[PDB]
Curated annotation (Swiss-Prot), chain B:
GO process terms (BP): double-strand break repair via nonhomologous end joining; nucleosome assembly; protein modification process; protein transport
Record note on disruption phenotype: Decreases acetylation of histone H3 'Lys-9' and 'Lys-23'. Simultaneous disruption of GCN5 abolishes acetylation of histone H3 'Lys-9' and 'Lys-27'. Abnormal protein sorting to vacuole.
UniProt KW Protein transport keyword: yes
Cellular component GO terms, alphabetical: chromatin; cytosol; H3 histone acetyltransferase complex; nucleus
Location within or outside the cell: Nucleus
Chief location: nucleus
Subunit (UniProt): Homodimer. Homotetramer. Forms a complex with RTT109; consisting of a VPS75 dimer contacted by two RTT109 subunits. Interacts with RTT109; the interaction is direct. Interacts with ASF1. Interacts with histone H3/H4 heterodimers and heterotetramers via histone H3.
Keywords noted in UniProt: Nucleus, Phosphoprotein, Protein transport, Transport
Recorded family membership: Belongs to the nucleosome assembly protein (NAP) family.
Whole-protein residues included: 11 to 221 of 264
UniProt-recorded name of the protein: Vacuolar protein sorting-associated protein 75
Function recorded in the entry: Histone chaperone which acts as a cofactor stimulating histone H3 acetylation by RTT109. Preferentially stimulates histone H3 'Lys-9' acetylation by RTT109. May also stimulate histone H3 'Lys-56' acetylation by RTT109. Assembles nucleosomes (in vitro).
GO molecular function: acetyltransferase activator activity; chromatin binding; histone binding; identical protein binding
Regions annotated as coiled coil: none
Species per Swiss-Prot/TrEMBL record: Saccharomyces cerevisiae (strain ATCC 204508 / S288c)
């Protein structure tokens, strides 16, 4: 009786989350089309954002300034095997010539069991300037200076592309909160942030 | 360049329309399920008594002497007003209580209180008649020194006259209690009853 009603409620909640996603999809497509015509749109938006700067390092800003595209996509539209909170984030970096490669990178975030957000590492080519803090390059990671170099690079935005949520205290700090920042604020409300930077 | 900005403004209109559309969609789907659920609940003896004692913060809103009267609730129904008319916010709702009553002290009675957004905007209400317990005669605003008035105004019966329009003058956190019923207690009552089983 009451148990069967409770299952119906969970069925209904997904149905409406799915209803929203399907309706929002074409609207985001149109919106992003306009966005692709505005020059420093994403640069302006990520500088305007209150909380975002706290997550990343100050030297990351020259590289995140080169972001000319952000695209969040909700995976529950792909399959009923995905939680409605599951999403991919696609970044395009224009790059910095002779330092940071022009590249497109997609990171996928999904619930594992309320459950927690997890991800997998995705390849991104680090800036040349970051060579000394590059975890794939640093030779002595246990040497006094090496430990601090490693830790510094793991705290950059490029460290976050390595984040999984499955190694507490070994990864980019609050990689999950940063992800939700994109899916819940930055990507949905970017236009509000751009108009705020306008006024 | 301003033509793009124009399209963005239209997109944000489209997003606001869509979000109300999905809210209405959820309310239409939930209504019949609640009805079926509540028919089973009506078969369970002290369901609401159990649920209201189980809830963490509910008791913090009301006086200790109120509990004997809230023990007599055998029906709580919440109905979302946006299903009536598109003139209501999707946050708008009425809440209907049935009190079994206490012989010689408290009448058996059914009371409906309506909550609605006025301008984000705030939750507001109008006073609804409720027959106070006769134990409360000395703290009944219709019977009253100003120590007693504030004591009655802090009871669950003071909440029934809460409006949200006289800040600092009414039942304290009447909006929070309202939102407790519509967002936690009524939606998730079966979960509270089940948590009381284990």
């Amino acid at each position: 009786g009451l148990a069967k009603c409770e299952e119906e409620v969970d069925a209904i909640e997904r149905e409406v989350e799915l209803y929203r996603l399907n309706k929002m999809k074409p609207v985001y497509e149109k919106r992003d089309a306009y966005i692709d015509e505005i020059a420093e749109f994403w640069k302006i938006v990520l500088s305007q954002h209150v909380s975002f700067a706290n997550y990343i390092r100050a030297s990351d800003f020259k590289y995140i300034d080169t972001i000319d595209k952000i695209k969040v996509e909700w995976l529950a539209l792909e399959s009923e095997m995905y939680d409605t909170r599951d999403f991919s984030i696609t970044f395009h970096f224009h790059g910095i010539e002779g330092d940071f490669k022009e590249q497109q990178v997609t990171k996928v975030f999904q619930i594992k069991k309320d459950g927690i957000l997890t991800s997998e590492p995705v390849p991104i080519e680090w800036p040349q300037s970051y060579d000394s803090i590059n975890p794939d390059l640093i030779k002595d990671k246990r040497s006094p200076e090496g430990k601090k170099k490693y830790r510094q690079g793991m705290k950059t935005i490029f460290g976050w592309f390595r984040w999984t949520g499955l190694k507490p205290g070994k990864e980019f700090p609050h990689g999950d909160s940063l992800a939700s920042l994109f899916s819940e604020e930055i990507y949905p409300f970017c236009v509000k942030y751009y108009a705020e930077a306008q006024r």
